[PDB]
């Protein structure tokens, strides 16, 4: 029963994390704590809490768990892996550059690069509409959808959560805050969807804004960047590798095509070191 817990505040392109080393510290963090610490007015303030633990499994380097500020063990945009990797390196918990980490969904493989960015294996995309889930007659590269009188062409992709991706001529003037929420809860998305607005600059470079399910516009949705790159490659607009500029900064997406994993590379930054009493 420690007096206090040491933590590091980190962010991956503006998605901000409270990170805890529970390898070296012993404590049982209760849901109560997640909710107290997550509050931006009266707490530390974070999008997610990331807890690093000893591998409860062999041939794995670490375990981690991710909680949102409301206490639930959900991680929509999948950027926490990069903060984890930079954290265990920065805190000298490992000298490995290729790290295998046990997570809720399975095993994440990641690699820390010499320039300090982190490449994360995000798994293959799911493209069959009913699996996304999305209502359509058959799998297609693009779907026509009627949204309160507007006909939109939307690609639908799952990175483990549902995404719809629409191409825009101009990401800065795109209707993110108007059409985002209309598509997010469209009946054809029975579990709702993250909605990406994708501006193609050339086959290897795009700009992206994402309306995140349940949240609104975010600085950098990793799985959204993955989905948008996949959607653009499938339609021939993009070719791997794709540099994707988000409001929070730049991600690099690699995808060799159907059935192959999407690889996401980007930065993760330390903001400050903190101590919070239990």
Which parts are annotated binding residues? 15, 48, 68, 78-79, 161, 194, 212-213, 222-223
Any contact of residue 11 with its own copies (CB under 8 A)? Answer: yes
Report strand pairing: 216-218 vs 205-212: antiparallel
Report the length, in residues, of the chain.
278
- Cα 275 to chain centroid distance, Å, stands at 27
Residue nearer to its own copies on the CB measure, 15 or 223: 15
Rounded Cα–Cα distance for residues 254 and 244 (Å): 11
Least separation in angstroms between CB 76 and its own copies = 16
Burial of 178 by CB count in 10 Å (0-12 exposed, 13-18 middle, 19+ buried)? exposed
Q: Which stretch binds its own copies (CB under 8 A): 37-45, 49-57, 146-154, 168-176?
A: 37-45
44 counts as binding its own copies under rule CB under 8 A:
yes
Segment near its own copies (CB under 8 A); pick from 12-20, 50-58, 106-114, 143-151: 12-20
Of the residues 77, 145, 154, 176, only one is catalytic, namely 77
Rank residues 104 and 177 by Cβ distance to its own copies and give the closer one: 177
Catalytic residue among 69, 108, 221, 262: 221
Token pair belonging to 70: 């409301």
Rounded-to-integer distance, Cα 189 and Cα 187, Å: 5
Among 21, 23, 43, 55, binds its own copies (CB under 8 A): 43
Strand partners, 101: 62, 108
* 77 a catalytic residue: yes
The yes or no reply on residue 22 touching its own copies (CB under 8 A) is no
Q: What is the CA radius of gyration of the chain?
A: 19
Q: Are 163 and 194 in contact (CB under 8 A)?
A: yes
Phi, psi of 91 (to 5 degrees): -85, 0
One residue of 38, 123, 222, 248 binding its own copies per CB under 8 A: 248
Q: What DSSP element (H or E) covers 62?
A: strand 62-68
Element (H, E) at 242: strand 242-246
Interaction between residue 42 and its own copies (CB under 8 A): yes
Mark the segment that binds its own copies (CB under 8 A) among 42-50, 62-70, 94-102, 130-138.
42-50
Cα within 13 Å of Cα(115), Cβ side:
5
Q: Does 212 bind its own copies (CB under 8 A)?
A: no
- Near its own copies by CB under 8 A: residue from 16, 102, 212, 254: 16
Closer to its own copies by CB, 232 or 248: give it: 248
Binding residues for substrate: 15, 48, 68, 78-79, 161, 194, 212-213, 222-223
DSSP 3-state of 80:
helix
| 221 is annotated as an active-site residue | yes
- The residues in 126-155 that bind its own copies, with binding defined as CB under 8 A, are none
Binding site for its own copies (CB under 8 A): 7, 9, 11, 14-16, 40-45, 219, 248, 269, 271-277
């Amino acid at each position: 029963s420690a007096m206090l817990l040491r933590f590091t505040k980190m962010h991956g392109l503006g998605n901000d994390f409270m990170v805890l080393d529970l390898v070296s510290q012993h404590a049982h963090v209760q849901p109560k704590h997640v909710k107290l610490w997550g509050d931006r007015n009266t707490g530390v303030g974070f999008d997610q809490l990331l807890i690093v633990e000893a591998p409860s499994s062999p041939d794995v380097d670490f375990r981690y768990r991710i909680f949102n500020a409301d206490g639930s063990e959900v991680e929509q945009c999948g950027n926490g892996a990069r903060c984890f990797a930079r954290f265990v390196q920065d805190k000298r918990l490992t000298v490995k550059k290729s790290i295998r980490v046990e997570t809720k969904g399975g095993i994440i493989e990641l690699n820390i690069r010499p320039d300090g960015q982190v490449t994360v294996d995000m798994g293959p995309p799911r493209l069959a509409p009913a699996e996304i889930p999305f209502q359509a007659e058959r799998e297609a590269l693009s779907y026509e959808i009627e949204v309160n009188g507007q006909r939109v062409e939307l690609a639908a992709v799952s990175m483990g959560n549902p995404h719809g991706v629409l191409r825009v001529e101009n990401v800065d003037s795109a209707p993110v805050h108007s059409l985002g929420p209309q598509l997010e809860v469209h009946p054809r998305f029975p579990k709702k969807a993250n909605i990406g607005f994708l501006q193609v600059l050339d086959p290897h470079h795009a700009r992206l804004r994402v309306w995140e399910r349940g949240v609104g516009e975010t600085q950098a949705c990793g799985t959204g960047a993955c989905a948008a790159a996949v959607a653009g490659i499938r339609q021939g607009w993009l070719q791997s590798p794709v540099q994707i500029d988000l409001p929070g900064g730049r991600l690099h997406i690699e995808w060799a095509g159907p059935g192959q994993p999407v690889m996401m590379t980007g930065p993760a930054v330390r903001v400050y070191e903190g101590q919070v009493r239990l």
